[PDB]
Each structure stands twice: as structure tokens, then as C-alpha cells.
Amino acid sequence: PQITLWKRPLVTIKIGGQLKEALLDTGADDTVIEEMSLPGRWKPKMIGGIGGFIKVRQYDQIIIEICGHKAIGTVLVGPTPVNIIGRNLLTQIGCTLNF
Amino acid sequence: PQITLWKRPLVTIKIGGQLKEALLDTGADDTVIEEMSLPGRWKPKMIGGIGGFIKVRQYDQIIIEICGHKAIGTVLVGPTPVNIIGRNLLTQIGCTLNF
Numbered sequence: 001p002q003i004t005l006w007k008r009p010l011v012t013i014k015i016g017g018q019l020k021e022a023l024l025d026t027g028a029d030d031t032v033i034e035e036m037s038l039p040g041r042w043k044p045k046m047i048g049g050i051g052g053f054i055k056v057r058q059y060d061q062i063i064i065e066i067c068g069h070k071a072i073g074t075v076l077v078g079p080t081p082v083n084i085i086g087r088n089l090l091t092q093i094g095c096t097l098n099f
Numbered sequence: 100p101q102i103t104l105w106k107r108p109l110v111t112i113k114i115g116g117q118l119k120e121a122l123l124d125t126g127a128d129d130t131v132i133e134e135m136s137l138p139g140r141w142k143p144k145m146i147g148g149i150g151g152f153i154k155v156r157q158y159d160q161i162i163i164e165i166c167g168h169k170a171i172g173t174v175l176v177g178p179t180p181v182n183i184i185g186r187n188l189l190t191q192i193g194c195t196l197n198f
């Protein structure tokens with residue numbers, strides 16, 4: 001699909017069998033999701049945002065569906081303003097910028 | 100053009116007679132640039148995200164040249180870690196997300 005940017009590029013995603021709203025964010029290297037229960041062990045990770053660096057939990061090979069496209073990859077969990085679908089997954093669903 | 104997301108989507112921009120590297124960011128509502136001098140009047144504003152909030156100066160009707168496309172809009176100036184081209188200007192150059 002083609003998504004314009006007159007409004008926030010928010011889509012519905014599915015993780016752990018639950019539907020959630022998330023932002024397609026080309027400015028984010030990673031995918032950051034609000035606090036939730038994910039399977040497996042996690043590793044520590046520092047990500048730097050507009051206001052500085054924070055600590056998040058990194059879960060690898062997590063199954064996640066984006067606007068109908070299934071992806072399997074790294075998902076970070078921590079204090080985020082909104083669910084962020086970053087480049088690591090956008091690339092997986094073949095998302096590109098065009099103008 | 101079509102830009103992949105394997106790596107940060109950085110482009111060169113010309114703003115206020117200065118050349119700068121900036122990030123095409125679909126997750127950003129606003130355009131935020133590192134400290135620089137800009138014409139016209141301005142007002143304070145607080146913006147926040149992953150690292151929390153930072154205070155910036157809002158300048159309106161600022162012209163920015165991005166990859167050959169001229170765009171006019173509000174530009175925020177402050178202590179941002181990376182120069183950000185947000186949706187307010189991405190729309191003006193006809194930039195869309197595609198997959």
C-alpha cells in the first residue's frame with residue numbers, strides 16, 4: 001500500500017495474539033513496544049531518542065504482524081510514547097520511502 | 100526517488116544558507132534542527148519522545164531545500180541529537196511510505 005504523511009502513519013499490528021496500534025517510524029532504528037509480556041529471555045539495550053538514552057528489554061525473533069504482513073525479529077520493550085515500528089521490521093515487510 | 104531502510108535515511112538539506120545532513124523521519128510530527136541562526140520571530144516549545152522532552156525555538160515559514168525539492172514550513176531549533184525532517188515537510192515533497 002502507499003501511505004501519505006498528512007497524518008501519523010499509524011497501523012494495526014498483532015503481537016502475542018493481541019491487536020495494537022503502532023507508528024511506522026523511519027527515524028527509529030529499532031521497534032519499541034509498550035510494556036507487555038513476551039516469551040523467552042531478554043538482553044539489555046540502550047537506545048537514544050529525542051530526549052536522550054534509555055534502557056529497554058531486547059527480545060529476539062519475536063513474531064509480529066504489521067498491517068497484515070508477518071515479520072519475525074527483534075522487539076524492544078520499555079517506556080515509549082507510542083508503539084514504534086522501526087527500520088529493522090519496516091525493511092522486513094519491504095517498506096521504502098518514495099518521492 | 101526510492102530509499103531503502105537498511106540504514107538511516109539521511110539526506111543533505113539546505114536551510115538558512117547552510118548545508119546539513121538530516122534524517123527523513125516519518126515518526127516525527129515536527130522538523131527539528133540543531134542550533135543555528137534563523138530569520139524571523141520565534142516562540143518556545145517543548146517536544147518529547149523516547150528520551151523525554153527538550154525545549155526548542157519554533158520558527159515559522161522557513162524554507163528548506165531537500166534533495167532538490169523546496170519546502171516551506173515550521174522548523175524547530177534546539178538540542179536535538181540528529182537533524183530531523185518531519186511529516187510537516189515530508190508531505191510537501193510528496194514523500195510516502197510504500198510496501
Ligand SMILES: Cc1c(O)cccc1C(=O)N[C@@H](Cc1ccccc1)[C@H](O)C(=O)N1CSC(C)(C)[C@H]1C(=O)NC(C)(C)C
Nearest residue numbers: 027028029030047049050126127128129146147148149181
Ligand atoms: C526509537 C529509536 C531507536 O530505537 C533508535 C534510534 C532512534 C530512535 C528514536 O527515538 N527516533 C526518533 C527521533 C530520533 C532519531 C535519531 C536520533 C535521535 C532521535 C524518531 O524516529 C521519532 O520521530 N519519534 C520517536 S518517539 C516520537 C513518536 C514522539 C517521535 C519523536 O521523537 N518526535 C519528535 C522529534 C517530534 C519529538
